[PDB]
Amino acid sequence: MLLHLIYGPTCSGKTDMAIQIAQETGWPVVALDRVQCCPQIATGSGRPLESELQSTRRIYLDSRPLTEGILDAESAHRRLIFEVDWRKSEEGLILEGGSISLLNCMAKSPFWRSGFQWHVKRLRLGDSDAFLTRAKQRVAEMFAIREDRPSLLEELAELWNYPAARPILEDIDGYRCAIRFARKHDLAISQLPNIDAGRHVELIEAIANEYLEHALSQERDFPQWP
Numbered sequence: 001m002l003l004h005l006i007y008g009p010t011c012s013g014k015t016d017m018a019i020q021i022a023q024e025t026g027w028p029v030v031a032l033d034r035v036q037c038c039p040q041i042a043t044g045s046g047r048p049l050e051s052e053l054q055s056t057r058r059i060y061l062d063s064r065p066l067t068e069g070i071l072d073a074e075s076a077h078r079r080l081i082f083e084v085d086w087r088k089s090e091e092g093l094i095l096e097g098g099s100i101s102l103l104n105c106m107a108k109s110p111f112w113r114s115g116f117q118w119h120v121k122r123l124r125l126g127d128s129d130a131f132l133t134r135a136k137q138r139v140a141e142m143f144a145i146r147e148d149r150p151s152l153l154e155e156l157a158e159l160w161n162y163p164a165a166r167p168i169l170e171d172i173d174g175y176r177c178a179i180r181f182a183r184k185h186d187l188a189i190s191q192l193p194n195i196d197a198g199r200h201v202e203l204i205e206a207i208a209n210e211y212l213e214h215a216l217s218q219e220r221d222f223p224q225w226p
């Protein structure tokens with residue numbers, strides 16, 4: 001079968017791309033993302049909206065409570081081989097995501113190196129400045145109060161109740177920032193949603209900047225794929 005592999009940093013449009021190829025071909029898209037396997041952090045982790053899948057399928061490598069820990073990379077990798085393997089007979093599948101440790105498992109795994117055709121697309125960040133514009137938009141959407149899906153701040157407040165979630169969230173991007181930012185301004189995590197006019201602007205800015213650190217370190221640590 002043909003695997004269409006799409007990887008690159010945070011906020012590069014990988015998913016809209018994947019959705020478009022999926023809506024053309026009919027193939028599912030497997031998310032190469034460990035953090036997105038915790039649906040309790042669906043928004044902050046970048047899962048697309050149901051509305052935005054446009055009836056196309058997107059497959060996650062597990063579905064797990066956040067307090068169970070983010071799915072480790074070698075478990076994710078074994079799950080990935082299985083999701084591709086059982087679909088062995090279909091025409092192709094789309095693998096899309098920005099997981100550093102998952103992509104590197106892939107690059108080191110004997111599974112991938114034979115018995116598949118590949119189309120491989122690597123998105124980059126270019127302008128730091130356009131990156132941050134792109135990033136601030138994405139953050140404002142993750143912050144939008146929506147009918148159907150909790151915002152990043154609402155997910156964050158929800159989970160802050162479980163002391164076990166706290167160290168885990170401190171290690172995840174967006175949430176890390178939001179938490180660091182609450183402590184900076186002597187705010188309770190619960191009050192982050194009612195954050196006043198421009199206080200809201202400094203937090204979007206700060207998360208977008210944390211996305212930047214992240215994307216730079218994704219450019220640093222990504223495998224170079226064949």
Ligand SMILES: Nc1ncnc2c1ncn2[C@@H]1O[C@H](COP(=O)(O)O)[C@@H](O)[C@H]1O
Binds near residue numbers: 046098100173
């Ligand atoms: N979808 C995501 N959302 C938020 N943070 C992420 C995401 N994927 C990776 N990270 C961050 O990058 C580290 C995970 O490594 P990796 O899966 O190898 O990129 C995580 O601990 C998070 O801090």
Ligand SMILES: CC(C)=CCSP(=O)(O)OP(=O)(O)O
Binds near residue numbers: 008010012044173174
């Ligand atoms: C928010 C962070 C750090 C990762 C999730 S964003 P992404 O890799 O899901 O975004 P794109 O599909 O590249 O827009």
Ligand SMILES: [Zn+2]
Binds near residue numbers: 014015046
């Ligand atoms: Zn995505």
Ligand SMILES: [Zn+2]
Binds near residue numbers: 173213214
């Ligand atoms: Zn990071």
